[PDB]
Amino acid sequence: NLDIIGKRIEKIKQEHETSWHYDQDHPYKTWAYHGSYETKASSMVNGVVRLLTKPWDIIPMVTQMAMTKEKVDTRTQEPKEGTKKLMKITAEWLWKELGKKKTPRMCTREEFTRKVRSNAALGAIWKSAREAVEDSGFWELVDKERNLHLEGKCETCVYNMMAIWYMWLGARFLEFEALGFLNEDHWFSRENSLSGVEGEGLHKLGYILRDVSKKEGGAMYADDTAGWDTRITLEDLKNEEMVTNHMEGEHKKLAEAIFKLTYQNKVVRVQRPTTVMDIISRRDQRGSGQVVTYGLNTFTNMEAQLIRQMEGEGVFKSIQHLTVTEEIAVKNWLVRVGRERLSRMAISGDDCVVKPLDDRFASALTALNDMGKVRKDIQQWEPSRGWNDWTQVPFCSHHFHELIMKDGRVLVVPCRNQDELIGRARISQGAGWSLRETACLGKSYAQMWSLMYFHRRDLRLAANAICSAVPSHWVPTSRTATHEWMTTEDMLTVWNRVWIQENPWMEDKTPVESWEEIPYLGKREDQWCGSLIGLTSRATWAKNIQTAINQVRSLIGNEEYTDYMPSMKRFRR
Ligand SMILES: O=S1(=O)CCCN1Cc1cccc(F)c1
Ligand SMILES: [Zn+2]
Ligand SMILES: [Zn+2]
C-alpha cells in the first residue's frame, strides 16, 4: 500500500503543508482517501458551420448538443479460479501471437518531441507542451523520475481527474517511452491482431464487417459493456503486464515500473466543490494515456471475447475450476482455431462485433459476467440479441450501407443519424479562436463529409457550401482513424485515391471523372437516416444556398474563393 504510493502522497502533502485538512465528510467508499488541500470548459458554437446549416437551427436534437461520476466509486468482485486460469492462458497465448511479427522497443524523446510539435492529444497539464520539450531542465526532471522507476519507486506520476485522467508530461513521456510501441508499431492492426482495426479508417470498417459476415456461423453480436474502464480488474492489469515477458534490458524494467507503479497502484487528485483537492488511490480500473488505454482495452476485449467464444463451443464446463485436461483443451483450441476465432471479430477498444461459430454464444454469459464485463441495457442472464444483417450492426458509433454505383461497382459506406453529424460540426472546444481558425475547422468537417458521408444529400450540399464559403487555399485545422480529409488537395482526387485506387475491395480501378458519377443512398433511406429532403425549410436552404455562401464570404472579407456548387447537377445551370 503506502509502500509504493507514499512518496507521491508525502510530496503533495509538503507542497500544501498549510492546508492539509483530513475531511471526515469525504464521500469515497471504494477509493481510499488520504488527505485534502485548498485550490480554486464549455462547448462553443462554430458560426461558419451554423450560418450554412440554417434549417437545423429549429431541430432540438442538433441545437441541444451545444448546451450545458458515481461509477468511478464502484467495486468489481474477484473472478473465480476457473475464470483467472482461462484469462492467464488466453493472455499468454495472445501476447505471443501479437509478438510473432513485431519487436517491442522503447519510443524516443525524439519521437515524443515530434508528436508534441504536431499537436497530438497526450492528456498533459512552461506554458504549452511545445515549450517544455525544447527546454532541458524538464528532461532532467524526466531523468530523475526515470532513474527512480529503474530503482522501482515513483515521485511525480500522479493522475488529475477531469472520466479522463491528465498527468504531468514527464509521466506521459515515461508512459510513451515504455508502451508507445503498441500504437507506434501498429500491434492492433488487422494484419497483426486479426480482430483489431487500429489504423483502418472509417472507409474500411464497413468492408471489414461485410468480410466477417461471409464466415459460416450464427448472428452478429455487438454487446456494449456498461462502463468498460471501471470494470478492468487487477487480474486484467496483471494479464496486460505480461507484454513485459517479451521485452529485455532497460525497456523491460521501464515497462514493469509503468505497470507496477502507475497502473496497478494509482494516485489521483479530484476537485470537490464543498473547492478542495481530494488525494485518493486505487489499484484497479483503467487510468492511463488515452492511446495506451485504447491498445490495452483492445487486448483485454479480444481476450474476453475468445473466452466467451470458448464458453459457447463447450471448451470448458464451469468457471468455478478448470480441470488439468480442460487446461490442455483450452490451450489446444487456441493453437488449433485461435487465429480463425480472432478473424470472426472486429474490436476497437471496448467496442466489439463477433460472428461466433453458432448462436450458443448468445447465452454463454458465465465467464463474461464473472470477468466483470457486464453487458449494458440487458438483464445479467438474458441472452444477447444478435443482428441478422451486417448492414444493421452498430460499430464505432456507425452503421454501414452497401451502395451500388451507376457503373455497377460496390461501395460500403459509413453512416449515422445526420442530426449527430450536423450537431458535432457546429461545436468547437477552447478559447481564442480567430474567424480564420473557426473557418478552417468548418472546412475540416466539410471535407470529412465529402469523403465519408458524400451519400447523404444534405451533407454533400452543406460540404460544397462550406468549401465555397471558406477561402480555397486556407488549410483545414483541428486542435484535437486515418484523416485523409486533412489536406488542401482537390476532394475529387482524394475520393478517387481512397474509394478506388487504394481500396482493396474494388477490382476495377477506373477513376471517377466527376462528383455526379458518385451515388447517394435511396431517397427514403436518406430520410430514415435523418435527411431533411422533402421539407420546405430544406428546399428554401438548397435553392438560396448562394445567399448563405455570400453571407459568410462577406464576414471573412475579400479573399480568393471557389464556387463548388456546380459540381452538383441542380447548380449546373
Ligand atoms: O423522398 S422524398 O421526400 C419524396 C419525393 C422525393 N423526395 C423529395 C426530394 C427532394 C429533393 C431531392 C430529393 F432527392 C428528393
Ligand atoms: Zn513515476
Ligand atoms: Zn444510414
Q: How far is the CA of 536 from the centre of ligand 1 (A)?
A: 11
Q: Which three cell numbers stand for residue 205?
A: 470498417
Ion ligand 2 contact residues with beta carbon within 5 A = 145, 154, 157
Cell of 160: 488529475
Contacts of residue 158, Cβ cutoff 8 Å, sequence gap at least 6: 8, 12, 167, 168, 171, 267, 268, 269
Is residue 510 located within the same domain as residue 437?
yes
Nearest CA, atom 5, ligand 1: 534
| Alpha helices in 151-288, H assignment, sequence order | 169-179, 181-184, 190-193, 205-213, 234-241, 249-257
Tell me the HSE value of 533 on the side-chain side, using a 13 A CA sphere: 19
Bridge partners, 37 (sequence order): 277
Q: Which atom of ligand 1 is nearest to the CA of 542?
A: 11
Q: How far apart are CA 162 and CA 142, in angstroms?
A: 24
Residue 354 corresponds to which amino acid? V
Residues 327 and 431 in one domain: no
Q: Is 376 annotated as a binding residue?
A: yes
Q: In whole angstroms, what is the distance from residue 565 CA to residue 473 CA?
A: 17
* CA 345–ligand 3 middle distance (angstroms): 22
Report the C-alpha gap between 416 and 28 in whole angstroms.
39
Q: Cα(397) to centroid of ligand 1, in Å? A: 27
The one-letter amino acid code at 411 reads: L
* DSSP-based three-state secondary structure for 425: helix
For residue 524, the ligand 1 atom closest to its alpha carbon is: 1
Whether residue 526 is annotated as binding a ligand: the answer is no
- Angstrom CA distances, 183 to 71, 186, 189, 295, stand at 28, 5, 9, 7
Rounded distance, CA 456 to CA 418, Å?
A: 8
Distance from C-alpha of 115 to C-alpha of 536, rounded to nearest angstrom? 48
Whether 219 and 255 share a structural domain:
no
**Residues shown for the chain:** 573
**Chain center to CA of 87:** 24
Q: Is 534 annotated as a binding residue?
A: no
Given 324, 351, 371, which residue is the final one in a domain? 371
For residues 91 and 21, membership in a common domain is answered with no
* Residue of 533, 540, 541 to mutate, ligand 1, most atoms within 8 A of C-beta: 533
Q: Is 297 annotated as a binding residue?
A: yes
Give 269's strand partners.
Answer: 160, 279
Cα–Cα distance, 224 to 351 (Å, whole number): 7
Take residue 108 and report the three cell numbers written for it: 524516443
Give the DSSP H or E segment for 9. helix 2-15
Distance between CA atoms of residues 377 and 373, nearest Å: 13
Ligand having the closest approach to the CA of 412: 3
Alpha carbon distances (Å) from 262 to 100, 285, 286, 512? 28, 12, 11, 52
Query: Is 503 annotated to bind ligand?
Result: no
Q: Do 450 and 502 belong to one domain?
A: yes
Rounded CA separation 2/10 (Å): 10
Domain boundary pick from 371, 386, 421: 371
Q: Phi first, then psi: what are they for 504, rounded to 5°?
A: -70, -10
Is residue 544 domain-resident? yes
β-pair partners for 354: 221, 345
Looking at residue 173, which CATH number applies to its domain?
Answer: 3.30.70.2840
Residue 261 Cα to ligand 2 middle (Å): 7
Q: Are 287 and 159 in contact (CB under 8 A)?
A: yes
Query: What letter would DSSP give residue 199?
Result: T
Ligand nearest to the CA of 171: 2
**320/452 same-domain check:** no
Looking at the structure, tell me whether residues 121 and 261 fall in a common domain. Answer: yes
Parent domain of 144: 1-38+108-179+234-283
Amino acid occupying residue 337: V
Same domain as 220, residue 82:
yes
User: For this experimental structure, what is the resolution in angstroms?
Assistant: 1.7
Q: Any alpha helices (H) in 344-404, and if so which ranges?
A: 366-370
C-alpha of residue 519 to centroid of ligand 1, in Å:
15
Cell matching residue 305: 471475447
What residues have CB less than 8 Å from 420, skipping those under 6 apart? 61, 65, 397, 530
Count how many domains the chain has: 3
Residue type, 372: G
Question: For residue 167, how far is its CA from the centre of ligand 2 (angstroms)?
Answer: 11
Closest residue by Cα to atom 11, ligand 1, is 533
Is 93 part of a structural domain of the chain? yes
3-state secondary structure 81-112: HHHHHHHHHHHHHHHHHHHCCCCCCCCCHHHH
User: Is residue 73 a part of any domain in this protein?
Assistant: no
CB 290 within 8 A of CB 164: yes
State yes or no: 225 annotated in a binding site.
yes
Give the number of the atom of ligand 1 that is nearest the alpha carbon of residue 457.
Answer: 14
Residue 504: exposed, middle, or buried by beta-carbon count in 10 A (0-12, 13-18, 19+)?
A: exposed
Residue 393 falls inside a structural domain: no
Which phi and psi (to 5°) does residue 345 adopt?
A: -130, 155
Q: Is 228 one of the annotated binding-site residues?
A: yes
CA of residue 109 to ligand 2 center, whole Å: 17
Q: Which of 455, 523, 526, 535 to mutate to test the pocket of ligand 1 (most atoms within 8 A of CB)?
A: 523
Last residue of a domain, one of 283, 313, 346: 283
Question: Is the residue at 530 inside a domain?
Answer: yes
The verdict on 317 and 348 lying in the same domain is yes
Using alpha carbons, list the distances in angstroms from residue 484 to 307, 364, 455, 487, 567.
36, 40, 17, 7, 20
Residue owning grid cell 461509477? 71
CA R_g for the chain: 26
- 394 Cα to the center of ligand 3, angstroms: 11
Residue 191: how many other CB atoms lie within 10 Å: 9
Q: Ligand 1 pocket by C-beta < 6 Å: which residues?
A: 457, 523-524, 527, 533-534
- Ligand that comes closest to the CA of residue 521: 3
Of all protein residues, whose CA lies closest to atom 12 belonging to ligand 1? 533
Residues 76, 82, 88, CA angle at the centre, nearest 5°?
80
- DSSP class of residue 167 equals B
Q: How was this structure determined?
A: X-ray
Residues 488 and 430 in one domain: yes
Ligand in closest contact with the CA of 5: 2
Helix (H, G, I), strand (E, B), or coil: what is residue 410?
A: strand
Which among 288, 239, 200 is positioned nearest to 96, based on CA atoms? 239
Q: Which of 49, 45, 41 is nearest to 66 (CA)?
A: 45
- Same domain (yes/no): 312, 174: no
Judge residue 528's burial from the number of C-beta atoms within 10 Å of its C-beta, 0-12 exposed, 13-18 middle, 19 or more buried: exposed
72 domain-assigned:
no
Q: Are 173 and 110 in contact (CB under 8 A)?
A: no
Assigned C-alpha cell, 517: 458519377
In a domain, 380, yes or no: no
Phi, psi of 79 (to 5 degrees): -60, 160
Identify which ligand lies nearest to the alpha carbon of 168: 2
Do the beta carbons of residue 369 and residue 380 sit within 8 Å?
Answer: yes
Residue 246 annotated as part of some ligand binding site: no
Euclidean distance between CA atoms 54 and 104, whole angstroms? 52
d(CA 462, CA 30): 49
From the DSSP assignment, how many helices (H) and strands (E) are in the chain? 23, 11
Q: How far apart are CA 110 and CA 5, in angstroms?
A: 30
All three cell numbers of 191, joined, read 494484419
452 CA distance to ligand 3 middle (Å): 12
Residues 429 and 486 in one domain: yes
Q: Measured between alpha carbons, how far is 384 from 93 in angstroms, rounded to an integer? A: 27
Query: For residue 172, is it within any domain?
Result: yes
